[PDB]
Curated annotation (Swiss-Prot):
Lineage, top ranks: Eukaryota, Metazoa, Chordata, Craniata, Vertebrata
Family: Belongs to the protein kinase superfamily. Ser/Thr protein kinase family.
Cited function: Involved in mitotic spindle assembly checkpoint signaling, a process that delays anaphase until chromosomes are bioriented on the spindle, and in the repair of incorrect mitotic kinetochore-spindle microtubule attachments. Phosphorylates MAD1L1 to promote the mitotic spindle assembly checkpoint. Phosphorylates CDCA8/Borealin leading to enhanced AURKB activity at the kinetochore. Phosphorylates SKA3 at 'Ser-34' leading to dissociation of the SKA complex from microtubules and destabilization of microtubule-kinetochore attachments. Phosphorylates KNL1, KNTC1 and autophosphorylates.
Protein name: Dual specificity protein kinase TTK
Disulfides per UniProt: none
Chain's gene name: TTK
Domain Protein kinase: start-end pairs: 10-254
Portion of the full-length sequence here: 519 to 794 of 857
Length: 257
């Protein structure tokens, strides 16, 4: 199978992702280089939806330059019927990698954490709060984590819908501190092998636990005290009492050794 994006021809290899009106394909260009093409169908898309897509593509294009922890967008073709986005191909998303890997190397975790902070820090510096960070939003590209989206474009039914990374303030109702909670949940999962409220099956009981101050989050003792402190700092229920990204970037866990 084959497709054209801005005059350039691409051979389709396999379908990566999907959605109600979107498909992601693994492709090859004329020079036999590997890419990901995100196809978006705009037939049933309303004006609100279109502007959400246009806004996200604009921010993805702009933030290319500011950090290599943001996915590469090489080119795109946008008409009234479709969007074709030629992007960087990743090895695997962080969620699939975490679900597959039994244990996680402490060096590998610290490395991924650094990348997650750099990517999220960059979007914040441009006025963007993601508000829905999960491990699925990150891509492993050459042992390096990259942020694939900014949470602007309207989400579609095909990890999606999950409340395990939701800050207490999002359940009550958004500031950059909201992303710190979600990042803290991802690190807690990479530390303890589960998210802080993963054991609570019932969604209502789970939402009640996240917002409950009397519901103490357990932080079992580990050889990395710096790591335990990060987790405790990210997971402060009060946004005003929570650590910021510039503060996490100066933290012993990210800087020592
Ligand atoms: C585990 O399956 C994979 C997951 C991700 C990628 N790589 C990938 C995924 C992507 N999703 C998007 C995307 C951006 N917004 N929505 C989807 C872009 C992109 C680039 N490479 C490759 C995989 O192996 C076949």
């Amino acid at each position: 199978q084959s497709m054209s994006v801005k005059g350039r021809i691409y051979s389709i290899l396999k379908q990566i992702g999907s959605g109600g009106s979107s498909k992601v394909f693994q492709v090859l260009n004329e020079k036999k280089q590997i890419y990901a093409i995100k196809y978006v169908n705009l037939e049933e898309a309303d004006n609100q939806t279109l502007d959400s897509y246009r806004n996200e593509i604009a921010y993805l294009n702009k933030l290319q330059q500011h950090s290599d922890k943001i996915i590469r967008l090489y080119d795109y073709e946008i008409t009234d019927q479709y969007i074709y986005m030629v992007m960087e191909c990743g090895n695997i998303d962080l969620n699939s990698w975490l679900k597959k890997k039994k244990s996680i190397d402490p060096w590998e975790r610290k490395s991924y954490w650094k990348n997650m902070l750099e990517a999220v820090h960059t979007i914040h510096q441009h006025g963007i709060v993601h508000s829905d960070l999960k491990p699925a939003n990150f891509l492993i590209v050459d042992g390096m984590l990259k942020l694939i989206d900014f949470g602007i474009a309207n989400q579609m039914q095909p990890q999606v819908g999950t409340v395990n990374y939701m800050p207490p303030e999002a359940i009550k109702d958004i500031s950059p501190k909201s992303d710190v909670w979600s990042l803290g949940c991802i690190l807690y999962y990479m530390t303890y092998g589960k998210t802080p409220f993963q054991q609570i099956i019932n969604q209502i009981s789970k939402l009640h636990a996240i917002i409950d101050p009397n519901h103490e989050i357990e932080f079992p003792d580990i050889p990395e005290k710096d790591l335990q402190d990060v987790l405790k700092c990210c997971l402060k229920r009060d946004p005003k009492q929570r650590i910021s990204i510039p503060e996490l970037l100066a933290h012993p866990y990210v800087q020592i050794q």
